[PDB]
């Protein structure tokens, strides 16, 4: 057992310091080892260039395959696959366009969604896709 003496504050303080460092959450937070762990490098969003549309080039009319695109992140040059929210938003997006990408799928994947894709397209030319779809804004060139 541990010491339960009246004059043992220094011994008790040393035990609690050691217990803190064994917590993996405490070490990671104080040393800053995982600040840049996420694919966005610590940011919540990222900007990318639309490479080409894998779903449309294949002729499968699944509508879950059709809304997959390939983009290249500007910050680190990685190539990822993202979802377009709806078929017909593909018409607003052209190749070599600049888009804003957010995360997707932490909660999970719905029925009819392709597993292993963890990104979605939110804006093109700094305009939200829903506003373009609803006819509230026009895409500047």
């Amino acid at each position: 057992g541990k010491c339960r003496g009246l004059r043992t504050a220094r011994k008790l303080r040393s035990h609690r310091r050691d217990q803190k460092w064994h917590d993996k959450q405490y070490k990671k937070a104080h040393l800053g080892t995982a600040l840049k762990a996420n694919p966005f490098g610590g940011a919540s969003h990222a900007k990318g260039i639309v490479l080409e549309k894998v779903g449309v080039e294949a002729k499968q009319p699944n509508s879950a395959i059709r809304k997959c695109v390939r983009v290249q992140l500007i910050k680190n040059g990685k190539k990822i696959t993202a979802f377009v929210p709806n078929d017909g938003c593909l018409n607003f997006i052209e190749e070599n366009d600049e888009v804003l990408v957010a995360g997707f799928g932490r909660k999970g994947h719905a029925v009819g969604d392709i597993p292993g894709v963890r990104f979605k397209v939110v804006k093109v030319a700094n305009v939200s896709l829903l506003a373009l779809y609803k006819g509230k804004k026009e895409r500047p060139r």
């Binding site: 999970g108 994947h109 719905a110 029925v111 969604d113 597993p115």
Partner: peptide
């Protein structure tokens, strides 16, 4: 008929996630 359908919809919701669907299919196998 509508009452019977609504009971199945709750079971459909009770596994509507992708990992849940693959969960039983290994278990039924």
């Amino acid at each position: 008929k509508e009452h019977f359908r609504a009971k199945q919809k709750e079971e459909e919701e009770k596994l509507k996630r992708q990992k849940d669907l693959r969960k039983k299919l290994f278990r039924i196998q």
